[PDB]
Amino acid sequence: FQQGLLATPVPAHARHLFFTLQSPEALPAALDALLPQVDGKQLLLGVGAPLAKALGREIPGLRPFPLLDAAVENPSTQHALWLWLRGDERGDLLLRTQALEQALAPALSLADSVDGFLHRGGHDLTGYEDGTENPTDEEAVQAAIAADGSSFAAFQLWKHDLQYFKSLPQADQDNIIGRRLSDNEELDDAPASAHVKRTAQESFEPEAFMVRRSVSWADQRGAGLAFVALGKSFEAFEVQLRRMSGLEDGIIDGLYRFSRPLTGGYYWCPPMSETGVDLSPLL
Amino acid sequence: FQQGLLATPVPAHARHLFFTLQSPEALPAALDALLPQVDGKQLLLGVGAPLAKALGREIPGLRPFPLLDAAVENPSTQHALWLWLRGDERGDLLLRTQALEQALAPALSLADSVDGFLHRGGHDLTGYEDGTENPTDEEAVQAAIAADGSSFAAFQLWKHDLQYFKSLPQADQDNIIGRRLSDNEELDDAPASAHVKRTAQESFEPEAFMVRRSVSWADQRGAGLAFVALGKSFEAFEVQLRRMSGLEDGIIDGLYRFSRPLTGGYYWCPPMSETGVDLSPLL
Amino acid sequence: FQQGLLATPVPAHARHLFFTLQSPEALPAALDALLPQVDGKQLLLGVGAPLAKALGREIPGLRPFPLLDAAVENPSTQHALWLWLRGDERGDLLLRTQALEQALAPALSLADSVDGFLHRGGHDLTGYEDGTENPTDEEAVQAAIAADGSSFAAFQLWKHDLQYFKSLPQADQDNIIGRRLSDNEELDDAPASAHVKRTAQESFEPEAFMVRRSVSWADQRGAGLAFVALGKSFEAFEVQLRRMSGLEDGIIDGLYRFSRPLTGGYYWCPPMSETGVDLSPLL
Amino acid sequence: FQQGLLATPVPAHARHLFFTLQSPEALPAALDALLPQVDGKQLLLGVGAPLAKALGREIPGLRPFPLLDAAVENPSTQHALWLWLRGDERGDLLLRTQALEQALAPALSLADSVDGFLHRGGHDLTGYEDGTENPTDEEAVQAAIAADGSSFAAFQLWKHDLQYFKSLPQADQDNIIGRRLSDNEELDDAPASAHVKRTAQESFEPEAFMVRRSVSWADQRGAGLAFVALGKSFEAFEVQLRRMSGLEDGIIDGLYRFSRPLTGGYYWCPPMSETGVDLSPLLR
Numbered sequence A, B, C: 001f002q003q004g005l006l007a008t009p010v011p012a013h014a015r016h017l018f019f020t021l022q023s024p025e026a027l028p029a030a031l032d033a034l035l036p037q038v039d040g041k042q043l044l045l046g047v048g049a050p051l052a053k054a055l056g057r058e059i060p061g062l063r064p065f066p067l068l069d070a071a072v073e074n075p076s077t078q079h080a081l082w083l084w085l086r087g088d089e090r091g092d093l094l095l096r097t098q099a100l101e102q103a104l105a106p107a108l109s110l111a112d113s114v115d116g117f118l119h120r121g122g123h124d125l126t127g128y129e130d131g132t133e134n135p136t137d138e139e140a141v142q143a144a145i146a147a148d149g150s151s152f153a154a155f156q157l158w159k160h161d162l163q164y165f166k167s168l169p170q171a172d173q174d175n176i177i178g179r180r181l182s183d184n185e186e187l188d189d190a191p192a193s194a195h196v197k198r199t200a201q202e203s204f205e206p207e208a209f210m211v212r213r214s215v216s217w218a219d220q221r222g223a224g225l226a227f228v229a230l231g232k233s234f235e236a237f238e239v240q241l242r243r244m245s246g247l248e249d250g251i252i253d254g255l256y257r258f259s260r261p262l263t264g265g266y267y268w269c270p271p272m273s274e275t276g277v278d279l280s281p282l283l
Numbered sequence D: 001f002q003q004g005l006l007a008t009p010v011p012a013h014a015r016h017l018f019f020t021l022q023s024p025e026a027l028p029a030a031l032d033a034l035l036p037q038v039d040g041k042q043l044l045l046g047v048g049a050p051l052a053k054a055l056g057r058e059i060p061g062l063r064p065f066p067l068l069d070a071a072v073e074n075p076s077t078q079h080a081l082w083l084w085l086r087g088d089e090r091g092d093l094l095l096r097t098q099a100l101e102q103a104l105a106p107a108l109s110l111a112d113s114v115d116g117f118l119h120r121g122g123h124d125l126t127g128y129e130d131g132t133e134n135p136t137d138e139e140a141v142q143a144a145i146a147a148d149g150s151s152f153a154a155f156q157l158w159k160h161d162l163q164y165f166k167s168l169p170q171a172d173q174d175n176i177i178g179r180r181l182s183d184n185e186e187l188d189d190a191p192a193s194a195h196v197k198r199t200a201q202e203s204f205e206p207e208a209f210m211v212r213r214s215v216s217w218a219d220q221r222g223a224g225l226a227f228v229a230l231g232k233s234f235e236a237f238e239v240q241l242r243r244m245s246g247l248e249d250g251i252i253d254g255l256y257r258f259s260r261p262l263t264g265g266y267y268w269c270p271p272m273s274e275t276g277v278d279l280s281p282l283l284r
């Protein structure tokens, strides 16, 4: 039906690969080696708008990452293919990507990769628990999985300024997130710019529910959160990001005081059949 | 009334700085230290759409880097401020950026920087001369400078695959560029995908003339061309990139066979007064 | 009373920090904040030869990493202080280093750091199990712990060429290691250049036994093995490396066909008292 | 009969390459393509001790970068081969290195590279002029060129903390260098830890003269000085570094307050013959 992008216990490590279609004529050999490996559990697949446009196919609901003319920076770095590796072994995830690069040889070239890890049981490097208000069980299926079993994922690589965020008094940190670090209690007196106040899923006229599967990351670029939002469409994520960016009321999310996204991508996660991944509407 | 963006001898070195508005309340102290240094000759200034939106001001013609839903990737990495340092001394430009970072420290944080150099007298790292068909003297002023003396610049950091491009036969390299490497003579029988055929300035519905001030670059990200396009508006550059991306006729520029842009930005270069740079429209 | 550097189950992640003594006048304040944190289990401490020289103290058995005039490269990158972080949470080790850098900010500066992880249950990224012939229980204490509670540690960051090593036939890989990858069986007819043949602990005039606590690593520098050898002295490690380098018989270890060390350091791990780590001899 | 290691006008840019001998069996094919390109002016060659050790040859005066048991850190990062590219075009030097990697492909692999540039006319990024007391003309030949026309070069990649050093008062900066930044006047009352006082070439019982051809550098590792010291032997440089490290009198050079070396290498620059560079002592 769907890919296992909602599996309850999240593995300790993840690796997100992003490929650019450098040689579209050599695409058939790449798909012959990739598709038998896409089980939706240890290796998940996402199709970008450039890949659909290059093959002359239109995927309903698929479009590139939007362009927000706001006072904050939300870059659009749309790629052709997104590979999401999951597993408890960090080195195993590293060796699979090296094999995936060779198997995808001339058609697709690696444009970006993220060595992600689950901090604690699902906490940001700032210490705050993330995933408290994520839909669970069937309501996660209703909010993240479309009718045909497919999902629409948005990815953003947020870079944290941990030194500055920890320089603030604890009351300033809690007012930025909207939750108390000591006990994860929601602050009902937080300013409207608080992240929890900006992204309250029930505070939108169409309820902007979504399933978030974010993990932490750290390399030469710094450290932060690899944000992943899964939805039955992109409308949930996009209406949240527009309000965080101040495009609705003029109030900008407090996250931008210490963190900014480095990348931005929209990807269509194809449905699963009983005999593997179903990429038919494209293939 | 314009910044010296057309100076006849291009200095041997350039340095392009891109800043993110991290703390908008501390902007006045940043502007007090920055504006006395903007002479338009050794330090040029460009205003991004995020900076205009944060101050609640609308500059006619200023908008973020566009989002092209094409089969090739032209990322949109719009920042708030662009500082363009020019000079013959590479170390002098480096020490000036360190002073500029410290002086703009809390309001603006450095998001990206490019150590550019003029290869030979104005050649791309592939060996082809770039700037052959650039307008000069008064025709350059009409194509790059608006009525109020301001200019609208588009920036792209292209990453070259020099090993692959030099692996091609010399006839294939000339057909990708559209010009003969041996004598810079235009190949009149090159395919429609040739770069010169894609960007023929006289072949556009309104003549899409522009002044290009590109330089080479090389660091840990690789090597390529720091593309800078100056126009009286963004319509010249944008109609060129849309045709290069196959959005007009379906034919994609041959440059994408060996090079792809890593960044994309639109910036408004304010006019010059007799008493320094004129930012009044935005104060 | 030794530091817990021999605990049988190795945590999933490690972090090796290396500091240079930039400001000796601020050293006492740095030690006042650091030494209460050295428990020898989650945070272990190693003293380098430069630190002993700066305080005018001589530690018996402490000397810098040697200089091997061989046909292979074993660089000597001796630092003043070594901090060895252990834990199952990769992000916890990251946030600890940020706090350790700030607390040691003026006296000691971070010269190098390694984000290490235990691959599978203790395998190299090439797939071979490492630690098969490591002494255990009392034999580990006899080989790694001196008469006092102290130990002498050697550190090397080996960079692997996994693409080249995996390109070789499996029989060629096994002849380099000296063991069969399929079943970890020792090859009794492997060439003398095999690693196991070069480092056979029982083949030295005094038996050169040692406890190895190496982990894998991967960052912008590549990927490989963070080699850690603990001994009652440096004579065990040093006599192994000289034979691996061909300084004994002229035969060079097969490891240098696909791997090379990037760093090299000798560090004295002080004993533990009931009141924390015991730096008496150095005061 | 020597490589153009003393040419008076230094080109605006340099690129120092360092190679590791990964596959000795493909070394003859690598040397066949490299040696005809070494003219000693735009491309200079330096032989490391591992390369001589791999060929079973002993070069008199060639040894790895030394091991200094001092209170400061001078790492020894000895490589097999050193290629020193010089030229006024930064991009030309980049394209020649990519071709050199392919020409040296399986035998030698690039271990480290430095994109160097001549700051101002010969100034450090701190602003101080470097090369003031460098020997010139024939006295440079006497100090840097051996009898057989060969030279022994020492290389160090120093990383500067410009933010910290420039935060200090100018009197503190001048006391570290031993010279006044405002007019390059030598401070005759500077502390013994001053760099000029530590490295005073006439203050050694055998005069430790050497020709320095350093350039600035800046990349992801930071910024500083790519230090290159040329001598008729390594004894000049080595006795200077021992004093800077406090191994002679216990006084450490003030440079270590804001800068530290990241690499260290000894390289033998072979003489030039009528038919190019002369590696005979290595290739009979």
Ligand code: HEM
Pocket (backbone or CB within 6 Å): A124, A128, A129, A130, A131, A132, A133, A134, A156, A158, A177, A179, A195, A196, A199, A200, A201, A202, A225, A227, A229, A237, A238, A240, A241, A244, A255, A259
């Ligand atoms: C650096 C980036 C981010 C960080 C550190 C972060 C952190 C957090 C934390 C700690 C919570 C509270 C725990 C929870 O309910 O999950 C939260 C909630 C939430 N966040 Fe984020 N977040 C980030 C980015 C985003 C983005 C880009 C979006 C949407 C475009 C988003 C949407 C949400 C939503 C919908 C909730 C649940 C709010 C509710 O219904 O109570 N987050 N986030």
Ligand code: HEM
Pocket (backbone or CB within 6 Å): B124, B128, B129, B130, B131, B132, B133, B134, B156, B158, B177, B179, B195, B196, B199, B200, B201, B202, B225, B227, B229, B237, B240, B241, B244, B255, B259
């Ligand atoms: C890797 C990136 C690029 C390279 C290597 C490159 C190189 C060149 C070269 C060698 C020429 C021929 C010499 C000349 O007439 O100037 C040329 C022409 C030109 N290019 Fe580019 N260019 C690049 C990107 C771009 C982009 C992104 C645009 C526009 C969006 C552009 C617009 C033009 C124009 C307008 C001309 C002049 C065509 C004419 O009127 O004859 N270039 N370029």
Ligand code: HEM
Pocket (backbone or CB within 6 Å): C124, C128, C129, C130, C131, C132, C133, C134, C156, C158, C177, C179, C195, C196, C199, C200, C201, C202, C210, C225, C227, C237, C238, C240, C241, C244, C255, C259, C260
């Ligand atoms: C890239 C670097 C290295 C790798 C990948 C590596 C890997 C291995 C492997 C696979 C084994 C066989 C399994 C075992 O008995 O533990 C082994 C054994 C051993 N290694 Fe290493 N090793 C490396 C470096 C070194 C160095 C530099 C030394 C000493 C200077 C060393 C000392 C030993 C010893 C003493 C043994 C046990 C040999 C025996 O008694 O059978 N290793 N290593």
Ligand code: HEM
Pocket (backbone or CB within 6 Å): D124, D128, D129, D130, D131, D132, D133, D134, D156, D158, D177, D179, D195, D196, D199, D200, D201, D202, D225, D227, D229, D237, D240, D241, D244, D255, D259
């Ligand atoms: C960060 C590293 C270094 C910097 C910034 C630096 C800079 C300078 C400066 C500004 C001078 C004075 C001007 C001149 O006479 O050229 C100087 C002199 C000198 N330096 Fe350095 N230098 C560095 C490293 C070294 C090292 C490592 C050595 C030797 C091991 C050395 C050897 C010398 C000598 C011999 C002199 C001439 C002293 C005299 O006779 O007056 N330098 N250097």
